[PDB]
Amino acid sequence: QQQRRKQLCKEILELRAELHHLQEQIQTAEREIVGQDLNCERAQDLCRRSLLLRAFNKKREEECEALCQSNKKIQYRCEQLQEIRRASQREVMFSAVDPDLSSSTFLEPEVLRDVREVCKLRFKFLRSLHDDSISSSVHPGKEDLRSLSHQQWMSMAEKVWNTHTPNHILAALERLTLNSTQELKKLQFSQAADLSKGPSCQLKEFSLLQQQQQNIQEACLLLDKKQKHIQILIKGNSSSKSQIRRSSVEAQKYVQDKLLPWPQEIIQESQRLQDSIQKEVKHFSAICLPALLKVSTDGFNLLPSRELSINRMSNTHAPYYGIFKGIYESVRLPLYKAPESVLSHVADMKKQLFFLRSQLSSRSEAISKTQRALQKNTNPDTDALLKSLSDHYSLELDEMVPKMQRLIQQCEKHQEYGKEVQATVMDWWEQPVQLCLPSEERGGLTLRQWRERWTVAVTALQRATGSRS
Amino acid sequence: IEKLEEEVKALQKQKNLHIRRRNKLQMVESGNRQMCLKSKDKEEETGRAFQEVLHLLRVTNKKLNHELQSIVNGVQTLMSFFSTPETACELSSQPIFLSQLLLDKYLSLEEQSTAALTSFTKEHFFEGMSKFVEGSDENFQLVQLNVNSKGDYDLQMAHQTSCSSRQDLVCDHLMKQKASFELLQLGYELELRKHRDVYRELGSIVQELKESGDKLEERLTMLSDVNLLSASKPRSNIDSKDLTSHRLYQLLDGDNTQKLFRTYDGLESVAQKLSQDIASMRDQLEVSEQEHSLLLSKLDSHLKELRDFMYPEGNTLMLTTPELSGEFHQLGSQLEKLNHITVEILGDLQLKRKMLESNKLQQIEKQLYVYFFQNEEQLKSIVGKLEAQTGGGSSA
Amino acid sequence: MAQTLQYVSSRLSMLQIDEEDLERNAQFGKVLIELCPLLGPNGGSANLNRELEETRRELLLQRKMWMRSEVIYQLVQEMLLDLQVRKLEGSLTEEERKFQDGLQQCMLVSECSRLLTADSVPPSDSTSILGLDKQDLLDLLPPNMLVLWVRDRLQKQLEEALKKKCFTFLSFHQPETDEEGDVLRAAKVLRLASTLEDEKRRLQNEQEKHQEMRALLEKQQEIYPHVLLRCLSLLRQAASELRLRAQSDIDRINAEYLEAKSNALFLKLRMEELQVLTDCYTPEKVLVHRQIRDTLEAGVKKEKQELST
Amino acid sequence: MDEKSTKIIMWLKKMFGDKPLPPYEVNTRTMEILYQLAEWNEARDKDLSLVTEDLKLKSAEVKAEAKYLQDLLTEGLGPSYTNLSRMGNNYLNQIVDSCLALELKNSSLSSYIPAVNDLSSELVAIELNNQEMEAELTSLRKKLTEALVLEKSLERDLKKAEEQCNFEKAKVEIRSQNMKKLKDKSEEYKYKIHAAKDQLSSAGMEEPLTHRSLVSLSETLTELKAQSMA
């Protein structure tokens, strides 16, 4: 399959690069997406400020409305008072008395008439008490009718004080005193004249002996009872007049002591609530809305939500954003991984190191052991040993082999030489030189003839015995 | 191949997944880019809305300031009605209130009216009443008559009757004066009551602002709370509040000491250092594998060289050269041939020496030409001699 | 001993140890085998590992509760954003504007309500922020009948948003589901959680397997140089003791022996040769030979003169 | 040896409680190994303690936050978010379940999309690295087996070689002895070769006085005679 296999391995390497190229394109888009996150938290804070401030505004408007109402109440007192003051400043012409004329009119004002009526009703009530005092006793039963005239008196009285200004009333009363006094002055003048004379010129103006005498005694008694009534009435007015003077000083002290310190205190309190909206709104525009958002992690303790360690990376606008992004790259953790994995990951990092450390220690030992064993196991060095093998090899071809071929050759020559030596034995035994004589005779016999004689001679010797060799 | 074919299939399905996720990813990217733009527009829109509510609040502040001022103005205007004179710049004005007015004048008039009644009671009634009937502070007070002071009797009665009428007149006059006082004294009481109401009113109004102020001061401190306010810069010091940064720093540096030298900058530094440490340890193990790879490549190179040198093609551990081993067997064989040749020669040689020892006639045979060349007589003798021992030929 | 080594090396990766260590301290190996169950494969002690696994499950549990509310919360944020963008393009129905207005206002109103509502119990004696309360905020929320209409509507919008959010999830993990029938897609959503869990667990197992194979490769690498050194040691023994010492001596003695043997046999032959010449060629015979030789030479001379002439 | 020894006895006491220690043999090596083990174990015991206490805090912050989104929702949405159909709930649980598995720091798509991408990319990378690492293991397994096959092949071949060398040496002892003798035999022969030569040359020994030359002289004499006549 080798060629198809090579083609497929190429296709895999080619595919792996392409997956990588796609993966790099995905990574680049992911990085832009992480950077492109929703925080609309800035905008939402601003929406929150608008709503908080709308609600705030309504609450302050409610406060304003309370103050408007307070201002109206003070404005009503001030209006009543400005009109009473204005009315008091006028001239009041009263009904004339010269007692010289009774053909004189000025009209009586209402203040005068209304004051004449309430004083007249009370005069009548005082007169019923008086009339009783001469007929000596308060009888029962007129006491209830009396309460009721007192209530009417109060009512005409409450009306006189509210409708008319105090200076006008006072003045009407002043005049009332004068008129009543004038009635006194007419009685004074007519009667004064008589006093240089006789007291019997007083019988011009309002005008058995034992029986007359009694009538004079009873008449003295009558004068005593009227004199006494005058004494209680004079002493009663003297207390009343005094009591008016005390009531004025007491009232004046109260006006001075009680009402006058108030404005400074109102000025103090008023300055404080001047610009409340502006002090508050100024601090609020500086404020941070998630810091106002409180969470309790004990059931008790409110801590600002932003100050939790879990929220630092959710928020891009947090100041710890930079610190905790940096913690993520340093501990080598993805841009989406839960905050809780940083600490477990650091323990894993410490573990990971101890693992690399041990493999390095183990490997260094494996390398060292092999190097010490290579040195012990070499006597001499492998490079020396390889040269020595090669020297010994080159030497067998050069010395040992050629010497052998020389010796093989030498044995073949000796072997051949041995055959020649047999030829030498054969000539020695047979001696063929004997046949080399052509016809040479000595003693007129050839060597052949001598030999034949010899052979024949040995054979005759052998024959005669019955031997042979 | 089956495994490669599945891998090509697998990588291809992955390829197909990444094309599809990527196209969606282009969609999501463009879309988030659109959101990023919209959110910047939302912060601007929201800033505008906010500025309007603050404008509404600028009017409300002005209004409030105005009402506060009215209250100051209102109270300022109110107190002037409660003035006794120290003008004479104005003699146009008079006070309202009865107690604020000069009662000296009315009281003096009442004091003259009493004086007019006193002068009257004194002048027409008997001399004898001089004891005190004169008056003045407020004019004051009548003591009783001597009354006693046929024709004589009738006269006495006439005088008495004149005193009876004159006393009735005094009595009505005092009673009119009493009514006048009674109105007036009640007039101070109705006024005090109005005065009391002002006192009460100002206290309620003042109390409302006082409470409002207290609530205000609580608020003014509260919003100015620095922890509630927007943040400072990052620190360079590990914040005390955060227990997490301290555990993390501890875990990494191997602190369990209380330092004071817990810095963010330090924290990051030791974290990066550890990551660096892991990369170094990995790099060193890689260097150690390469050293190990050199050591093995050397032993293997050694091993092929040594095996190839001892072995002739890979067959067997041969020592000897084939050529030399073959020669040694071949030479030995030549030597064994060579012994035989030797043995042959000596065997023939031995036999022939044994013959010359056994027959003398045969030694002599081989000697005949020696005798031929040297002594013809000796040849004749010896040959003659063998014939002589055992008869020869003759012819005659 | 091989078992103990594998058991300790697989469970605790932080020890370089070999079999020789165990051999020399027979009892120590028993000690090592016992310490592994009291540790774990993590290096942490057994108690600590149990506690860690117990806190993780409990944390995951609370984390699931936060996450159910969190999905819903996020779906609303996404919804309000969606409808608001659509409001700006002028591509929003009137009903959606009402839905949007009611729903936005409700979230701002709850968000500002949550700022006030204190996990403590304020005193009377404390101001809340800006002097307000929840009721001041509900006053600015639109009339209850619109609120009720949005809420009735929200369950259906929420279900569409969930369906969509789950489909999206499905679309990225498994792009294959977008080309499926409606029945098949309903099945595939049901498998979405399980399938992603299987891929993660597989990645973790794949990591465990890498570490296991990493140990094996390193252990095989320990034995392998040691075998290469023995094979060399044997070759070195062959080379040294046999080829260079013994064989050179062997080769020397054989070559010399074979020469000595050849020369000796030759000389022996030569002596027996000389014995033969002495017996054949005595001075007497030689004198006689000289005479025969002269007789043939003299004859040869007579014929030569006659041939020449 | 004594500071290390104390830490190790205590650490070991830490492991077994108030129980006996298992006997072992004392030497340097065993302590050094025990010391690395004790070190790993202590470092991790600290680490796991620190991690557990954070996880307890995180659960409480998360719970606190959970209560906060739940409250936010009750107030904002009313009760209607809790009403869903069965299929609504299933879709929800899956969303939540995908989020818990990929350990997202919220439910946003911006986080979710990188998580799927990273999980797939890593899973394929670890798997491919694991395949390549199996093939290499297997290759190294053949190399080790092959190497071992050579060691035994070498034992056998060395052993046959040793037998050959032992045979050759034994023969070399006989040959070495036979050679010394052969040199001696040669020296003896040589003196006898000169003594004989001296008589033989003095005896007038020469080549034309031999049988072979003399027969050669005789055949030439007959042949020459024929020419001479012709």
Numbering used by the authors:
A (entry chain E): 82 to 288, 405 to 666
B (entry chain C): 97 to 245, 351 to 597
C (entry chain D): 1 to 309
D (entry chain B): 1 to 230
Paper text:
In mitosis, the augmin complex binds to spindle microtubules to recruit the γ-tubulin ring complex (γ-TuRC), the principal microtubule nucleator, for the formation of branched microtubules. The elongated structure of the augmin complex is characterised by extensive coiled-coil segments and comprises two structural elements with distinct but complementary functions in γ-TuRC and microtubule binding, linked by a flexible hinge. The augmin complex is recruited to microtubules via a composite microtubule binding site comprising a positively charged unordered extension and two calponin homology domains. By acting as an elongated structural scaffold, augmin positions the γ-TuRC on the pre-existing microtubule in a partially flexible manner, allowing the γ-TuRC to nucleate a branched microtubule in an approximate orientation with respect to the mother microtubule.
Aiming to validate the TIII models predicted by AlphaFold-Multimer using experimental approaches, we purified the X. laevis TIII tetramer after recombinant expression (HAUS1-EGFP-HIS8, 2xFLAG-HAUS3, HAUS4 and HAUS5) in insect cells. We next subjected the purified augmin TIII tetramer to cryo-EM single particle analysis, obtaining a cryo-EM reconstruction at 7.7 Å global resolution (and Methods section). Strikingly, the predicted TIII models provided an almost ideal fit into the cryo-EM reconstruction, explaining all resolved density segments on secondary structure level. We next optimised the fit of the highest-scoring model into the cryo-EM density by molecular dynamics flexible fitting (MDFF), which resulted in only minor adjustments. The overall elongated structure of the augmin TIII tetramer is characterised almost entirely by extensive coiled-coil segments that are predominantly formed in a pair-wise manner between HAUS3 – HAUS5 and HAUS1 – HAUS4, respectively. The TIII structure is characterised by a central ‘bulge’ region, composed of all four HAUS proteins, separating the TIII tetramer into two segments. While one of the two segments is assembled exclusively from the HAUS3 and HAUS5 subunits (H3/H5-arm), the other segment is formed by all four HAUS proteins (4H-arm). The N-terminal segments of all HAUS proteins are located in the bulge region, while their C-terminal segments form the 4H-arm. The very C-termini of HAUS1 and 4 are located at the tip of the 4H-arm and are predicted to form a flexible kinked coiled-coil. Cumulatively, integrating structural data from cryo-EM, crosslinking mass spectrometry and neural network-based structure prediction, we could in detail elucidate the structure and conformational plasticity of the augmin TIII tetramer, the functional module for γ-TuRC binding. These data indicate that the core segments of TIII form an overall rigid structural scaffold likely serving for specific binding and positioning of the γ-TuRC relative to the pre-existing microtubule.
